[PDB]
Amino acid sequence: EFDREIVDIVDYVMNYEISSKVAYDTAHYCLLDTLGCGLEALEYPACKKLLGPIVPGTVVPNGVRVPGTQFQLDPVQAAFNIGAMIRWLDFNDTWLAAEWGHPSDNLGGILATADWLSRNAVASGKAPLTMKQVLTAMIKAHEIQGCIALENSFNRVGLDHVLLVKVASTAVVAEMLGLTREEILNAVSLAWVDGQSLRTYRHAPNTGTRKSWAAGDATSRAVRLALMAKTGEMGYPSALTAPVWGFYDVSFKGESFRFQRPYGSYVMENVLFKISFPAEFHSQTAVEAAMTLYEQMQAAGKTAADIEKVTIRTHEACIRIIDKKGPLNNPADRDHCIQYMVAIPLLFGRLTAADYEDNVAQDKRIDALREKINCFEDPAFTADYHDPEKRAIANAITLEFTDGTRFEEVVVEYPIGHARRRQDGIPKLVDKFKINLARQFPTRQQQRILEVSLDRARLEQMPVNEYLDLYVI
Amino acid sequence: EFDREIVDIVDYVMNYEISSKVAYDTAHYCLLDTLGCGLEALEYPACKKLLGPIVPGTVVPNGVRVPGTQFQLDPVQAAFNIGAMIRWLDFNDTWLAAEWGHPSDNLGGILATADWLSRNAVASGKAPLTMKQVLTAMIKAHEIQGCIALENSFNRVGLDHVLLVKVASTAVVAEMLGLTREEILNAVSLAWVDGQSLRTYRHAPNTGTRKSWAAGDATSRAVRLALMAKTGEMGYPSALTAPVWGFYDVSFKGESFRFQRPYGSYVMENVLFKISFPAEFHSQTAVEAAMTLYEQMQAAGKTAADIEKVTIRTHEACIRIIDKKGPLNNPADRDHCIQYMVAIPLLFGRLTAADYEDNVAQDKRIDALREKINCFEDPAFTADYHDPEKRAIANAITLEFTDGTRFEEVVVEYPIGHARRRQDGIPKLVDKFKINLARQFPTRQQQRILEVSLDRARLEQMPVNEYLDLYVI
Secondary structure (H helix, E strand, C coil): CCCHHHHHHHHHHHHCCCCCHHHHHHHHHHHHHHHHHHHHHCCCHHHHCCCCCCCCCCECCCCEECCCCCCEECHHHHHHHHHHHHHHCCCCCEECCCCCECHHHHHHHHHHHHHHHHHHHHHCCCCCCEHHHHHHHHHHHHHHHHHHHHHCCCCCCCECCHHHHHHHHHHHHHHHCCCCHHHHHHHHHHHHHCCECECHHHCCCCCCCHHHHHHHHHHHHHHHHHHHHHCCCCCCCCCCCCCCCCHHHHHCCCCCCCCCCCCCCHHHHCCECCCCCCCCHHHHHHHHHHHHHHHHHHCCCCCHHHEEEEEEEECHHHHHHCCCCCCCCCHHHHCCCCCHHHHHHHHCCCCCCCCCCCCCCCCHHHCCHHHHEEEEECHHHHHHHHCCCCCCCCEEEEEEECCCCECCCEEECCCCCCHHHHHHHHHHHHHHHHHHHHHHCCHHHHHHHHHHHHCHHHHHHCEHHHHHHHHCC | CCCHHHHHHHHHHHHCCCCCHHHHHHHHHHHHHHHHHHHHHCCCHHHHCCCCCCCCCCECCCCEECCCCCCEECHHHHHHHHHHHHHHCCCCCECCCCCCCCHHHHHHHHHHHHHHHHHHHHHCCCCCCEHHHHHHHHHHHHHHHHHHCCCCCCHHHCECCHHHHHHHHHHHHHHHCCCCHHHHHHHHHHHHCCCECECHHHCCCCCCCHHHHHHHHHHHHHHHHHHHHHCCCCCCCCCCCCCCCCHHHHHCCCCCCCCCCCCCCHHHHHCECCCCCCCCCCCHHHHHHHHHHHHHHHHCCCCHHHEEEEEEEECHHHHHHHCCCCCCCCHHHHCCCHHHHHHHHHHHCCCCHHHHCHHHHCCHHHHHHHHCEEEEECHHHHHHHHCCCCCCCCEEEEEEECCCCECCCEEECCCCCCHHHHHHHHHHHHHHHHHHHHHHCCHHHHHHHHHHHHCHHHHHHCEHHHHHCCCCC
16 A cells, blocks of 8 residues: 555565666775765864763664764764765765765664674674665665656755655665565655754755755654664655645645656766865866866966956856856855856966865956856757766866967866766766775774775675774774 | 853853742652652553663663663663653653743753762762752753743654653763863753654554653753764764754754743743542543532532533643543543533542543443533733733633522632642652652652652762662662
8 A cells, every 4th residue: 555656665674685886886986985974074073072971981782983073873873974974065076966865874873783783793693684675775776766766846846855865775675684674665765754853954044054964864864764664663655645734745845756767877887086176066078178278278378367258158056056257265166166166277287175265266267257157058968967878077178379370179078076087987986985094093904904995806795783883993 | 152042041051040939849849759750650561661771781880870760871771761761651750831841851961970979989089979960950951941941942843852861861961971162062052963753653553652751761862962062072063053964054943042031930830730539630620629619519419410400611731632522442542622621520520531431431421511511711820821920821610500590600820830839839749759759669668769859958968879889779
C-alpha cells in the first residue's frame, strides 16, 4: 500500500546490482575526497565545537571511531560528526540539478552505521563489513538523492535539500542494518513524515553556519529513524500521497515527484569534484580558458592592458547565477562574478581565493577590464548543459585587442572537476587528499592511509573498522 | 534584529515573575499527574521498545535517571524517553484552543535537562536545581505553547502541534542552561528554522504509534538545539519574517502569528486533567449528568427502559466532534459518540473502557436507548466554551419517561477535570497518581514518593536529582 516512490527506493536499495566500473571508481575517489574534507574541517573551531558526544566522558561499547579525533560515539551522534565535518568547508562533491546538493553527505550515516556494525561483529567474533559495502551504499545513496533532485526542486517550496539526504541515508542505512523489506519501507516513510528544515540559513540576511551542518544532521536523523524501524516501529504507507496530510499537499504544493529515469548508478558516474580554482562552478571552464589566454598572450608579447573587449559565450545558468556589472568589495561579489574571475587570470595569470577581497582588488583593470566583459548566452552550450550524456559547463572567451587583431576564442566544454576530465582531475583530487591527510597525521600515518586508500582492490577488502582505525589519533 | 515574536518569548522566559498561587498549585499537581502517566506507559511493550539508550551498554557520566526504569541517558535521549512515556497512553493534561495540545509534554525536556544539571552540579560540588525550578519551567513552557496555540492553528497548515512543544521547550531549556539572552534568542530561532513534523500519523489510514512519541521527540529536539546554542552556535533573526525563506511564507501561508494575550500563567491556570471516566472531553459533562440521572432514576424507581426521550442541550464543538448517529463498529467509534457514552451511564450506571468493546456493544438496549438520544446546540453554552474566563464544556440532560413525567434538567457546565472543579478534581487526580505508582513500584516506594510529592514545601526545596532517585528501579 506504500506509495510507488517509496517502494521504488526500497526495492532499488534492496535488489539492484551495480555493475559499472566507472560507478565504483568514482565512488572510490569520492570517499577519499570526502574524508579529506572532513580532516580539513578539523582545523576550524566553529566546526569542532559541535563535535564529540552530547555528554563528554560518555563511553559507548564499540563506538564509531570518528576520523582525526578521539571520539567513539554511538552510530547516530557519530553520523552527525562525520556528516558535519565532510560538508563544513563545502569542498565535497557536488550534484547540480533541479535541486542542488552534495550526495557525499550521506557518507555520515553510511560510514557511522558501517563502522559500528563492523565493530560489533568483530566483537562477537563475526565477520565485519568491508569498504566495498560502503562504496556500494554510497553509489546507491547518490542515486536516490541524485535522481529525485533531477527534476524535483524543493528550494522552490522553501525547504532545504538536506531532506533528500535524510531519505537517501535512511534507505541505505536501513538496508545496511539488515532490516526486512517491511521494516525498510517503514523507515523511509518515517523520513518523509519527519519534519523538513527550511533554507533560511542559506539565504541573506540569515546566512549562518547551519548551512554547514544541516546535512550532517539530516543523515544523522536517518540513522535514528532507521534504528527505530529496526525496533519494529510502524510505517505510514501514503506518507507522500495522503489526501490532505501527505507530504505532497502539505509541503510540496499539491504537486508530485517527477522522474526522468529509474534508479541506477548514473549520479555517481557524473558527480562534480571541487578540485580546482576557488571560482564558482559555472565559471570553471571560463577560468581555465582565461589561463590559456594568459600564456598565449605571453608567447605573443601581449599585455592584459591591450584588451578592449572580451565577449564570453557562456550557458544558460551562468549568466543567471554569476554576473554583476558595477563595482563590488565583498566575497559574494567577486566569488560570484564571471567577469571578475576571468579578469584576474588575464591580468595576473592565476586565481587564488586570496583575490576576493580589497587588498588585491585595487588595480584599475579590477574595475576597468571587468567593464570590457560581455557575457551573453548561446543555445549550443545551454543544450549540452542539460544533456544527460554531457552535462557540460562550457565557456568561450574572445580577446579583442587594440592592435586590430583578436585572439582565437578559446572554448572549454568540461571543467577539470567534471566526469569527462578525470584524466586531469584525479591527479588534482589525489593532491588535495594528500594535503588534507597531512593536516592531521604524521608523515608515517599519511603513507599508510594513502597506500591503502589509493589501492581500490586492497581497500575494498578491508573491514570498515580496520580502515577507519587508520584515522585514529 | 530578532523577530518580535522570538524576542517576546525570550524576555518572558528570562524575566517574567509568576505571581500566581493558582499557577504554582496546579503546576504541582500537573507534575505528579504527568509522572504517573509515564509509569502506566512502561507496561506497554510498544512504548518501552523505543526507550533506553541508542546503544546498549552505553555509560553516561551523571546521566539522567529516567523515572520508572534503570536507564541513565544523556539529556537529549532522556528527554525523548520521558516525553514518549508521559504522552504514550494519552492520559496527559490537555489545552483546547485554536490548536489542541498537551503542554505537559514539555516536562520531558524540562526534567531531563534539570536532572542532568543537578547531577552535574553535585559531581562538581556546585548547587543542584530544585523541583521548584522545574515547577516554574513548566508554567513557562505551558504558557509559550498554550498562548501561541490560542489563535494560531498549525493543524490547518499541515504541520503537527508538536512544533509548539519544540519551540516552548527550547526557550525554557535554553534559559535553564544559563545561556545569555543572545544565546537563548539563537536557540528559539534555531527551533523555528527547524523542520516541523507532519501530522500524517494522526489521521487514518496512516494513523500510527508516532502519534504517541511525536512530542517526546520534539522536546528531545529542543534539548538538542539548546545544547548547540550553548556552544555558541548562531541564530537567525528573521527566522519567521524572512521574505521567502522565513517560516511564515514557507509554512504559515505568508500569514503572521496572532496573540490574543501576552505570556503570563493563563495556560497552567486553565489546563484540563484527564481524571474521570474514559470519555472525550466534550462529553465528560454529559457522562457526569447521566451518572447523576441514573441514581436519580433509582430513587424514583425507574430504569432506562422507562425513558422515551433524552434531550441533551450542548455546545457547538461537542456537536460537530462527537455527535455521531448511525452504527458503531470498532470501540474507537463508540469512544467518540456522545449518545453512546451517555447511554451506558443511564443503563449500567458506570463507564469504563471495557464498556466500549463489542463485548458490551452487543446489548441491544444501548442502541435502542441511543435512538431516543437527541442533542441540540445552545448558543449560550457555545459562548461559555469560547469565553476565556470560562472555557466551559457544558452539557445538560433532560429525561422524559413513558410514565408521562420528566426529570428536572441536570446541568453541568465544567468537567470535573476543569480548573473550576479542583476541589473535586484533586482527590480524584491524586488517587490516579497513586494507582500509577502501584503499576511500577512496591508498597514502600509508593509511600516514599507520595509523601514527598504531596508535601509541596518539601518537594520544592528538594534537589531535582534527589527526587528522580525515588522513581529509580
